[PDB]
Design a protein around this motif. Structure first.
Motif, PDB file in Angstrom:
ATOM      1  N   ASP A  49       0.813  -1.211   0.000  1.00 53.17           N
ATOM      2  CA  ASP A  49       0.000   0.000   0.000  1.00 53.17           C
ATOM      3  C   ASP A  49       0.846   1.260   0.000  1.00 53.17           C
TER       4      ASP A  49
ATOM      5  N   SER B 248      -6.877  -1.424   4.520  1.00 50.73           N
ATOM      6  CA  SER B 248      -6.325  -1.509   3.180  1.00 50.73           C
ATOM      7  C   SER B 248      -7.412  -1.646   2.119  1.00 50.73           C
TER       8      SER B 248
ATOM      9  N   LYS C 168     -12.163   1.103  -2.587  1.00 53.45           N
ATOM     10  CA  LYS C 168     -12.023   0.221  -3.750  1.00 53.45           C
ATOM     11  C   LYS C 168     -13.377  -0.464  -3.911  1.00 53.45           C
TER      12      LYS C 168
HETATM   13 MG   LIG Z   1      -4.453   1.443  -0.290  1.00 49.84          MG
END
Ligand SMILES: [Mg+2]
Ligand SMILES: Nc1ncnc2c1ncn2[C@@H]1O[C@H](COP(=O)(O)OP(=O)(O)NP(=O)(O)O)[C@@H](O)[C@H]1O
Ligand SMILES: Nc1ncnc2c1ncn2[C@@H]1O[C@H](COP(=O)(O)OP(=O)(O)NP(=O)(O)O)[C@@H](O)[C@H]1O
Ligand SMILES: Nc1ncnc2c1ncn2[C@@H]1O[C@H](COP(=O)(O)OP(=O)(O)NP(=O)(O)O)[C@@H](O)[C@H]1O
Ligand SMILES: [Mg+2]
Ligand SMILES: [Mg+2]
Lengths: 518, 518, 518
Positions: A87, A153, A157
């Motif tokens: 990341d 994370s 998305k």
């Molecule tokens: Mg990320």
């Protein structure tokens, strides 16, 4: 006096600096919109018409055909960040661009680049000391923190709605394949396989404690399911073997036509009989399997698969415990592996082989499902990052609050460090510090919040409540990221600043650009 | 500062969203006219001039040469829906496009795509829960419901005139090859063969409880018809075998010229003798058959066929109970299969072989007839869907009313769910529920009924009478689809909503489109 | 069958509607960003490289080279709005675009365009009745409200910095040239001249109670300043007159060469002597002035200007009270006008003539100054609007609050009117009402405020506190526009809805677009 070929382009001094910096800034501005929980995605269509849809900065920059040299240099920042920490590829590029933007202000003031560069180097080095100190140390295998790391994370998305499931799969996968040397963990991500099959939805994705192979059982008569499978792993082909040295049969009598034919039939049969004698009832062969061999395997009730990829053979060994044998004749029962179930099943009407229920698998498989091929490719990318950040924490038992809390902590402290340094270097250090704020700023920006106000409030609250204070883009206000379980690996920030910094310093040192004619 | 290559086109923000949504909507609008009993067909002619006439959405989108990236993404929805459930490929694409259309209204309202997306994800997930709950559990092998399922998918197609016959063939085929493992059936569609020959009419299509192969009997003297056949399946060629290892005959005396020739003849004759001695009167060979062998086979009164396709060999094994033998030498009576009749018949003047009257065939063949090749191809596509939906219900065991009934139920419940969620997210859940109405709406539109009034009447009746209330495009009014026997597999709706929603959400998160110059 | 020429493009039904509506929306979206206090400007460059920088929608749409017909039709909305009321050109275009957008939603719902069109016409007719009712009747010449009208108009444009001055100038100019027939004022804007000269700043712009003319004193010996001027206005050239009928002198003796020569000198001298004898010391001639004439005017100490523009002659008459005379011989003292001072002065080094201090001028001049020609032109544009709205109020003693209050009041009342009408027509009326909200919406949008929230709050406050509640884009919240003095002429809203409604209805009626090849 003609020195350079016609067509050569040259920029020097401020021209070269202006051009390089503007190009790096534009690249950074281009990917900054993908940053954070409210960050959006891009659709990239190449010259051949192939389509990629992502939120991943590294994937984006790697795909688009960039022309300007300085823009290309920015790609290396995202690439290196991706390989080291997973990341923060967007973060590293965005900070690098802001670092250059803040430095040009000093360049316009006529401050010598060697001064700006010295200041940036001091600030970057100081930033590492600060990161190492404020980092929150934890048990490398603490499941709760691990889950938080993975979930954080998988946000911003299109597979975040299933972040809980996906985070759970990523953490189980990594912990299962993690190798504990003594008191420190080491993780080889090559032991975690990702298998994708369109159909169903992302919810149906799962972790198989074994291996999923895109293959079929070679012969129709062989079993399609085997309960307590004894797995054999042969990499040599089950065919009539030939010497390495050139050789040819010289026939001098009719009866030899049949004798040699029968000898090759016996050699084939011996191989299979041998496999059967070990007790194996499932066999993976890396090369081919002659039809005659297939027939005998089937006759013995043994399930066989041919042309298995080398990497799959290795995962099979690590999962089942079987040892890859080169020559069938060396295969012994001690070489056999185990699996609770080996079965050929259809996914999206396509036959595949599942090796599940392995004892203590050293290799594992995450089966990804999804409504479309593109959706599944993006979930794999989201999982690739989840798995890397979990790995980061298991190898570095250290984490940090997210939501821009770390960069704010760095901006406040580095601004203070500038004061103890003094002079023109201090100017550079203050700008470096100010630059680190594009993260919180862009997080708020992408969320549609007032950027100026959010900054005032977050920095102020952070000064009053401590390290964990960052920006909550959902509630549109400062919040304790630590309390919210919004954390990231220490390594993400460390590598991000290293790559962003060294690249900014390199670009800032350039006062001459000479480009040949393409 | 030249960052991207000339010829590169880019769209950002609202422009990106606008272009992507329009393209997807247009693809949906293009296929929505094929939906339902009153849906029409399309004629697709490619670059080479090949012609496809069909009502199938997957096929249509597969054939059309689509340019726009978003349009291309819509092809995947149809493809996945087709692989997984067969039917509902049009439904999934139409819902996806409408989902996008409803979302743009919220985008134009300035609601963040992150919120719309989350709202859509909540609705999609809630939709799966609702579908699982209202799903009508049925007997996996209940013939009557299975028949209603098949007949329902066949309506609205070119072969609907014969839906009774065709639904019967489909149901019978699946039932026959279906495998029960434990109260739950598993169906491998590869065991159902579709053989098609233009000639006669669709009414003459039939189910052969065995296999129909497009091959001739190899030798003119062999029997053209064998009653109680003892079938042998051999994959190795009936010819002089040669070793894998290179070999050559070194002749040193004239007598050898004949001796080696007679040895090769004996070898051929032995292969045939061995086949005969097992009692086999029919032999299917995957590879070739040497002339001499054909001669001896004929002398023995054995019918033989050569160069038989692998998939056909496998279907023959499954239907006749024969075991594929690799080497003739290994053939034995126990490997022989059975067929009440094996015969070479001419269809439209072309020789074919029928293997019929098998005992308990595990592989079967639906012989399709039709007055035209184009007619027959479309009948095949209709049968592919019918067999898939019948499969869906036997593997699953849940059905749903059709005629837009499930989507009305969903719209009604998601609307309430919206209220309990409230906020901007509820606005998105509301739009998602409203989108599901294009199904009843287009079912009516294609039928020429008044869309606005039909919707009002159906939704009202549905609220009064329940789950089974959908639109009846023939009577032109709301009706209990359950009473009418108009049902569809649960799997169709579930997959359709999953693929339609994940694709829509993904398209919705795009705010940057960068396409290279082709 | 070839009926239309090759190259002809055609769109029918839904396609024609989609394309026309999309084109009109895009145009509206292009200019909405200029709307309000926080609206920005556009820089327009034509093919000749000529530059136009402005905030004025009418000017923008006029100067841009539009291609799509639907877009060109939107230009007319701005032009008609501009001619009738001045301000509100952006508002009109933006509403038309929004109306079309809301209508398409009904088209997609299959509601017949004649019904949508019917509802829209009803809503628009109702709107006019509502605006007439809620309109605030004010005193036609109340300097206080007039000043608020002018100031409100000027804000949102560069040169808003000097809104106090500019508003003051606009009001004084209109008040001065206004003609009161009977309580009812009528204003002829041709009586207010705008003279522009780069140099100094906008702050130096002023109102001249007389006329400023870009001309020079024809003869160097003439006075450059005349105190209590007695002004003569002649349109005939001061030259040797020739008959309309062809004529030629036929000379037959040498002494005639001098006699005819001296006769023309005398004719010229007489004309001048006649002017002097009336008492005139300042003379404006529309045509030319022969050198001899100039010489004698100078001898007489008379200031004269030749080739004066017709429009300037009329302005000098109305300003000074002089009467334009065709032939010099008809000039009498009673024909002379008056000016406290007439003087030639240099502005930016260029000579000009000031006719100031006139008694009760009926024509006036606003001298615009600014540091750049572009600034000067945009200031003139602001003054043209300011002068038009002041005019609107003096002719129609009626005003309305600004800040989107009017459209909010209409949206609320029209929504209730809808329920009273019911049916599908109610659907269109409700949509028409909702469409009016883009004004409050984009006012906020251009200010960077949260659209969804601002609307909820303003509509709510408007319901509690009434008519004057609109959006305060500065304080970022609802406010009483009346208390704030933020008002606009009733005519603006009235014409805006009329032009936007009729255009929207016209475009909505198009279901066939046939365009020939250029
Ligand atoms: Mg990320
Ligand atoms: N729930 C959350 N609230 C606020 N900020 C968050 C949250 N989750 C993550 N972040 C922050 O968002 C940033 C990560 O955004 P992201 O778009 O994933 O880019 P990246 O990690 O910089 N690069 P990459 O993931 O490699 O594409 C980090 O600065 C996080 O601390
Ligand atoms: N007798 C019927 N009355 C009303 N609706 C029906 C009837 N039979 C089928 N339907 C509906 O028609 C739709 C199916 O139409 P169809 O044209 O086959 O497209 P699809 O199933 O969406 N996709 P595909 O089958 O993959 O080409 C479903 O929404 C059914 O519920
Ligand atoms: N102080 C203010 N606060 C809030 N709204 C205002 C204020 N002053 C003016 N407005 C509103 O802003 C709009 C006018 O914006 P403007 O950009 O001048 O466009 P226009 O008048 O529609 N067209 P144009 O002819 O180009 O001026 C009207 O709807 C006003 O009511
Ligand atoms: Mg169907
Ligand atoms: Mg204005």
């Amino acid at each position: 006096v003609v020195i350079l070929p016609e067509g050569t382009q040259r920029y020097v001094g401020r021209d070269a600096q202006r051009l390089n910096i503007l190009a790096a800034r534009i690249i950074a501005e281009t990917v900054r919109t993908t940053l954070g929980p409210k960050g959006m995605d891009k659709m990239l269509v190449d010259s051949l018409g192939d389509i990629v849809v992502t939120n991943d900065c590294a994937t984006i920059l790697d795909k688009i055909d960039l022309q300007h040299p300085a823009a290309k240099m920015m790609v290396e920042v995202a690439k290196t960040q991706d390989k080291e920490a997973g990341d923060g590829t967007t973060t590293a590029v965005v900070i690098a661009g802001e670092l250059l933007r803040k430095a040009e202000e000093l360049l316009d003031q006529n401050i010598h680049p060697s001064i700006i560069t010295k200041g940036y180097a001091l600030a970057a080095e100081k930033a590492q000391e600060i990161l190492d100190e404020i980092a929150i140390r934890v048990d490398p295998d603490d499941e709760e923190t691990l889950l938080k790391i993975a979930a954080t994370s998988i946000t911003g998305k299109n597979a975040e709605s299933h972040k809980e499931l996906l985070a759970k799969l990523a953490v189980e996968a990594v912990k299962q394949v993690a190798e504990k040397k003594d008191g420190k963990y080491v993780v080889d991500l090559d032991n975690i396989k990702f298998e994708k099959k369109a159909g169903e939805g992302v919810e149906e994705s799962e972790l198989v404690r074994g291996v999923v192979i895109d293959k079929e059982v070679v012969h129709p008569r062989m079993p399609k399911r085997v309960e307590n499978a004894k797995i054999a792993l042969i990499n040599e082909a089950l065919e009539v073997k030939k010497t390495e040295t050139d050789a040819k049969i010289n026939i001098t009598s009719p009866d030899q036509l049949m004798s040699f034919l029968e000898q090759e039939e016996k050699m084939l049969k011996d191989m299979v009989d041998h496999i059967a004698q070990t007790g194996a009832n499932v066999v993976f062969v890396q090369k081919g399997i002659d039809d005659l061999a297939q027939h005998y395997l089937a006759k013995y009730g043994i399930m066989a698969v041919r042309r298995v990829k080398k990497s799959d053979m290795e995962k099979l060994a690590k999962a089942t415990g079987a040892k890859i044998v080169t020559n069938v004749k060396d295969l012994t029962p001690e070489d056999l592996g185990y699996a609770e179930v080996v079965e050929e099943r259809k996914l999206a009407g396509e036959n595949m082989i599942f090796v599940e229920g392995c004892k203590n698998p050293k290799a594992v498989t995450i089966l990804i499902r999804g409504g479309t091929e593109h959706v599944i490719d993006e979930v794999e990318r989201a999982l690739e990052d989840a798995v890397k950040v979990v790995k980061d924490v298991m190898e570095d038992g250290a984490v940090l609050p997210a939501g821009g809390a770390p960069e704010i902590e760095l901006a406040i402290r580095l601004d203070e460090y500038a004061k103890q340094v003094g002079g023109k270097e201090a100017l550079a250090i203050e700008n470096f510090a100010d630059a680190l704020k594009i993260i919180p700023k862009t997080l708020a920006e992408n969320a549609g919040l007032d950027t100026v106000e959010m900054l005032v409030k977050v920095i102020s609250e952070h000064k009053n409540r401590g390290l964990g204070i960052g920006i909550d883009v959902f509630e549109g206000k400062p919040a304790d990221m630590l309390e919210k379980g919004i954390i990231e690996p220490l390594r993400v920030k460390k590598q991000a600043i290293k790559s962003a910094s060294e690249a900014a310093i390199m670009i800032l040192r350039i006062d001459d650009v000479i480009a040949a004619k393409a």
